[PDB]
Amino acid sequence: HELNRDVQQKVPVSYMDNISFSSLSSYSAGLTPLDIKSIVETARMTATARFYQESKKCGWLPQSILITQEDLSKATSKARNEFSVSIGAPQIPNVTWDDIGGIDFVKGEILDTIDMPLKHPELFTSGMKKRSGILFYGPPGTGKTLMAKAIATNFSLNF
Amino acid sequence: LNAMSRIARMVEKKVSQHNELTGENISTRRWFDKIATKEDTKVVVKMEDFLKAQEQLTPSVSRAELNHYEAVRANFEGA
Amino acid sequence: LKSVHRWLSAADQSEVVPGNDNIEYFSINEHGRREENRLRLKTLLQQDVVHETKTSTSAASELTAVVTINDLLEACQETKPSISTSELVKLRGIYDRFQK
Numbered sequence: 001h002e003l004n005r006d007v008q009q010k011v012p013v014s015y016m017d018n019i020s021f022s023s024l025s026s027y028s029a030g031l032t033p034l035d036i037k038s039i040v041e042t043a044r045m046t047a048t049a050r051f052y053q054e055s056k057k058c059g060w061l062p063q064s065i066l067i068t069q070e071d072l073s074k075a076t077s078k079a080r081n082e083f084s085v086s087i088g089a090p091q092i093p094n095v096t097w098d099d100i101g102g103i104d105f106v107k108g109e110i111l112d113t114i115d116m117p118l119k120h121p122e123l124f125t126s127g128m129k130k131r132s133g134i135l136f137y138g139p140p141g142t143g144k145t146l147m148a149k150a151i152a153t154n155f156s157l158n159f
Numbered sequence: 160l161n162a163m164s165r166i167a168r169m170v171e172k173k174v175s176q177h178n179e180l181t182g183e184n185i186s187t188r189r190w191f192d193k194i195a196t197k198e199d200t201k202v203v204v205k206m207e208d209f210l211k212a213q214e215q216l217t218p219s220v221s222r223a224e225l226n227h228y229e230a231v232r233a234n235f236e237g238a
Numbered sequence: 239l240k241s242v243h244r245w246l247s248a249a250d251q252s253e254v255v256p257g258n259d260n261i262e263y264f265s266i267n268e269h270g271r272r273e274e275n276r277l278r279l280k281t282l283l284q285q286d287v288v289h290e291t292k293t294s295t296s297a298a299s300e301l302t303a304v305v306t307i308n309d310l311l312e313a314c315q316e317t318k319p320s321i322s323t324s325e326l327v328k329l330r331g332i333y334d335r336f337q338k
């Protein structure tokens with residue numbers, strides 16, 4: 001009853017199921033430092049709109065407003081987009097060109113160097129071991145950008 | 160500097176008679192209060208010092224360098 | 239580095255929570271969604287109270303990655319850093335006498 005507090009509509013609001021807070025927390029809630037209220041209110045908005053647009057007959061009637069994780073993901077994408085103007089933030093505008101694990105021999109090195117400092121790919125804490133970055137070198141125009149987005153969105157989280 | 164080294168070891172072995180646990184007199188590491196006879200600190204040179212210095216101190220100008228600057232002098236201004 | 243590599247190889251970082259999902263199929267699991275395995279996994283995740291994950295981080299016991307003399311010998315007589323004293327002879331050659 002935070003949602004319900006002042007939304008004085010006929011029936012209260014709730015999710016009641018199916019959402020996965022780890023997914024919401026991890027997927028893009030990084031750099032949403034506070035004002036998740038924006039996210040949850042946009043979710044309420046989509047849900048309530050989808051509710052009220054129902055016809056009286058409609059073949060069916062919904063008893064109460066229910067938020068779904070798909071609209072919440074949509075809302076978080078929208079929020080990140082509208083925040084982009086405030087502060088620059090890359091997106092995923094890529095089509096039919098993603099997660100080519102077999103693209104080249106280079107991929108194995110990328111994976112075997114991105115893994116060690118992370119727990120889930122490599123249990124070692126890399127205490128004394130030297131962490132390092134990855135530099136690509138060669139003629140321009142033949143793979144230096146798409147690799148980065150691919151790696152970031154498939155194995156890492158933020159780009 | 161040789162005198163300083165000598166007096167340094169002198170002071171060290173002197174305070175080693177009072178700082179050690181068998182003496183347990185003073186361990187402040189400020190022993191000049193204990194050695195209040197500042198005159199005892201007087202460094203004075205001896206032929207040991209000058210002899211070793213003459214042994215351990217090459218001329219700081221090369222024969223080549225002195226020759227070169229003699230040549231420079233050979234540009235004897237006004238002639 | 240070699241010791242931690244050997245420790246990683248020995249541990250092999252394998253055989254973690256095998257067979258977590260239980261077998262729960264039922265006959266009527268037809269006439270509808272054909273991804274019933276995904277839905278069942280979804281529900282098995284959902285029945286959990288919350289993502290506690292209060293596991294003991296000390297279980298790894300990373301301190302056991304100790305070296306051995308055989309591992310020490312993995313040096314394999316690495317190349318010298320200084321090519322040759324011949325390149326540096328003059329260094330002391332000029333300072334056989336006292337310094338300037």
Ligand SMILES: Nc1ncnc2c1ncn2[C@@H]1O[C@H](COP(=O)(O)OP(=O)(O)O)[C@@H](O)[C@H]1O
Pocket residue numbers: 097103140141142143144145146147
């Ligand atoms: N082997 C490849 N790996 C990744 N992307 C490729 C590859 N070959 C072609 N491409 C496509 O063409 C582009 C290759 O060059 P790119 O990475 O854009 O370098 P530049 O930024 O210098 O143009 C990529 O953006 C991608 O769309």
